[PDB]
Design a binder for this molecule. Structure first.
Ligand SMILES: NCCc1c[nH]c2ccccc12
Ligand SMILES: NCCc1c[nH]c2ccccc12
Lengths: 360, 109, 361, 119
């Protein structure tokens, strides 16, 4: 006689798992994270995230963090903005952390919900609509700092070469760097020189992030860089993604989470489309271009499969791309990406996919 | 074959098959809780030609799985025969009544 | 220059309105009522109903009643089952009435959420999973108490010839009648003789409801009757919807809210499909059959448009049908229904549509 | 061209209608409201993103304020995602990838309106 049981763990190893953040925009109060095995396309489980959830996996791979909004009666009653800590293997709720009722509600750019390199602090974007960066102490389960210095800035770019440092893009076209102390409070800060012209060459917020520098692409196909090998960030650019032939056909970048970097080679991946003009910066990819950031030249180009967002796994040399509903898996161990498979119907309305971390 | 609505054990499933949802025919996906109560189907086994009682326990406390939706009604009856009835939420008495998916648990002949 | 404003009323008058109860099964925590104009297919507004909402309009036409379930954190935390009162013209929330945490969670059969003829009590199905009927005092905004007499029964059929009486179908194949007092407690009750064999000829719960009687169809295409013109309910049947030709091709009923009665003419409307057998009782309509309940003969048959549920308006002589997503409007002033229009994409997963009440005293 | 209530219903309900040039959301005119009125039981956002849109009928450019209507769940009808002169969140009030109901008593967003401010 068979017996139904609960309490089970996800059936595939952590190193196989990816996380597709489904906004379910048509029914945005029932957003969720779908967990998939990228090796075979199998659905592994899910985490419910209420109204416009955001998600990330802890750097140590043990927990899933979500950020969401509740009201007592959904469309009326008192608001509660929270971070939730979930077990990564059991996909169960463990802890709620209260936030002030101003967490960013918006589509799932990576930089709206991040963590420090040492994993001890969650770093999230607020908008009331005045902007600030909120700091959650994971060990304490508390919102510990509100970085009002980041007013007029947007999004969080962690520095992988420091334990508790991150940058944000400001309305002056520069970057603000925040270094947190071991208590999560601001220990120091600095502002770069202007990197880009906000009016004349706006950048996409999505970084192509290396260990000690970040690259950004612009609405017109230029590349800017921020070097944070030192305490002061040094900024440079532009160089153009485009050669003369590319310009003739008006190629420009487009998408959401639209770039990525393969750190061992310095290859940068960017979604591009032809016939660019004002208003096409979120168009699906006609192609993925592969750029050598050292030589500042393109090395390869492949079909884009109408993708809008991507992410990279360094240690397995993989790139995922995502068109809103379907996830494509690519091998990027060599300069030309090779399509391995497509996972159809991974989401109804997703613009963000992430790997389970394996680095520890 | 177990992920198909026409699999013999699924003859009175109205819901999403848990085997498509990170669980199996008889286990809930991670972080969803079995319902203690269930509707019952009597399903024909195409191998031995005998009918078997299948207990359809819902998995509860997570939002709709959305995969492998089935609506099969072999020997299903209205709510005045309540435990043969599948147009209700068999998670109705769980700590959280949100319905995630349905299992197909073989009881016996 | 231009200024955005709220506080507006529904743009079309009440007599144009219908209510499509969208379960949104794929995302059942965001169920809602869609309000449409049946005369032109225009979307007029909506009422959010959280997890598996149910809906009705007050008999006097002024308010929309919903029934739903909340939890503090949706998939965890304390449960709150409620009835909500909404203004029909402003589509705004007015009042929450607390229920015990056992209101029926299930697809939207009419009989799960009803009201007395006089409009004074809301009458709803509970399942814990033990069944009882819940009574809500509309004037007081209060839950009265369980009708525990209805254990082992299912669904609510109001008696339109009495102010606060209703019936329910019980597992013994008969009907239980409940008569409420002015306070919404049970004043008296009675139980009919067996109407149908539960094992051999199970009926669909959806009534074809007249002022002083109700008809029910069975899995095998038989009809049963309950006459409540007197204090004791008198039961009868079966008679067959089917002639020899019908039987030869195994025509049977199928659907959810699958019947209706046009009271003035005594015409009964029923969703039917061929090649019936065990397991086909919820199949979409291949046809709609129109039966004269007096002569017990079919007077019309038309294409079913894969419809699953219907509703009748006595005051304008209309029938609506619904296939899950689309609503069809019919004129039924003559024996053969005439298709007036289809509203495409009215819902993602709806099995219930209702008119805004006109008249009905 | 400046008065959508006088225009063709099918025209204002199109994503291509000139004043919808930075709408990311469901058009309120398809949701039981109009271009400048929230559907019954939904509440205007006091804040908005702003677009600059060209009117081809009279050849002038107008500032359009995109207020959300709030406190009801997603309308689901006439979804648009137009991006003319839209910029990222470091130009916050030009940005349409956020919920402009974010500061309302209830932040659930229902649909978006396209309100003409001026030249
Ligand atoms: N104004 C629409 C902003 C938006 C697009 N996609 C989303 C997803 C979640 C929340 C907001 C959005
Ligand atoms: N076990 C499936 C019952 C069902 C069908 N439709 C529904 C809507 C709401 C709740 C349950 C249901």
């Amino acid at each position: 006689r068979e017996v139904l049981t609960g309490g089970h763990s996800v059936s595939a190893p952590q190193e196989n798992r990816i996380y597709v953040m489904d906004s379910v925009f048509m029914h945005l109060t029932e957003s969720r994270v779908h967990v998939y095995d990228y090796t075979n396309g199998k659905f592994l489980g899910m985490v419910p995230t209420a109204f416009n959830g955001h998600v990330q996996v802890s750097n140590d791979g043990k927990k899933i963090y979500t950020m969401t909004t509740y009201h007592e009666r959904i469309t009326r009653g008192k608001r509660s903005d929270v971070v939730e800590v979930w077990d990564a293997d059991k996909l169960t709720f463990e802890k709620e952390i209260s936030l002030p009722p101003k967490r960013v509600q918006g589509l799932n750019y990576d930089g709206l919900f991040r963590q420090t390199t040492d994993g001890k602090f969650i770093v999230l974007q607020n908008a009331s609509p005045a902007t600030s960066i909120g700091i959650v102490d994971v060990a304490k389960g508390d919102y510990v700092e509100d970085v009002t210095a980041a007013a007029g800035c947007w999004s969080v770019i962690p520095q992988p070469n420091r334990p508790r440092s991150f940058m944000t893009i400001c309305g002056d076209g520069g970057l603000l760097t925040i270094n947190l102390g071991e208590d999560g409070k601001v220990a120091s800060q600095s502002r770069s020189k202007q990197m880009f012209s906000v009016k004349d060459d706006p950048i996409f917020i999505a970084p192509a992030l290396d260990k000690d520098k970040a690259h950004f692409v612009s609405y017109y196909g230029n590349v800017y860089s921020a070097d944070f090998s030192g305490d002061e960030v040094k900024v440079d650019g532009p160089w153009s993604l485009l050669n003369d032939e590319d310009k003739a056909k008006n190629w420009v970048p487009g998408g959401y989470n639209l770039v990525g970097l393969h750190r061992a080679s310095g290859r940068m991946y960017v979604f591009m489309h032809p016939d660019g003009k004002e208003g096409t910066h979120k168009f699906p990819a006609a192609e993925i271009w592969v750029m050598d950031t050292k030589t500042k030249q393109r090395v390869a180009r492949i079909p884009g499969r109408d993708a809008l967002s991507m992410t990279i796994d360094q240690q397995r040399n993989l790139m995922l791309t995502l068109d809103g509903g379907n996830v494509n898996v690519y091998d990027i161990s060599q300069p030309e990406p090779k399509l391995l498979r497509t996972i159809e119907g991974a989401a109804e309305a997703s613009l963000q996919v992430q790997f389970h971390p394996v680095g520890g | 074959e177990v992920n198909s609505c026409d699999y013999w054990r699924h003859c009175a499933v109205d819901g999403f098959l848990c085997s498509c949802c990170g669980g199996t025919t008889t286990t809930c996906p991670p972080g969803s809780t079995p319902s203690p109560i269930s509707w019952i189907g009597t399903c024909h086994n195409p191998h031995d030609g005998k009918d078997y009682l299948i207990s359809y326990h819902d998995c509860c406390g997570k939002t709709a799985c959305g995969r492998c939706q089935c609506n099969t009604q072999t020997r299903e009856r209205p709510g005045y025969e309540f435990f043969l009835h599948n147009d209700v939420n068999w998670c109705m008495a769980n700590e959280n009544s949100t319905f995630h998916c349905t299992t197909s648990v073989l009881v016996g002949l």
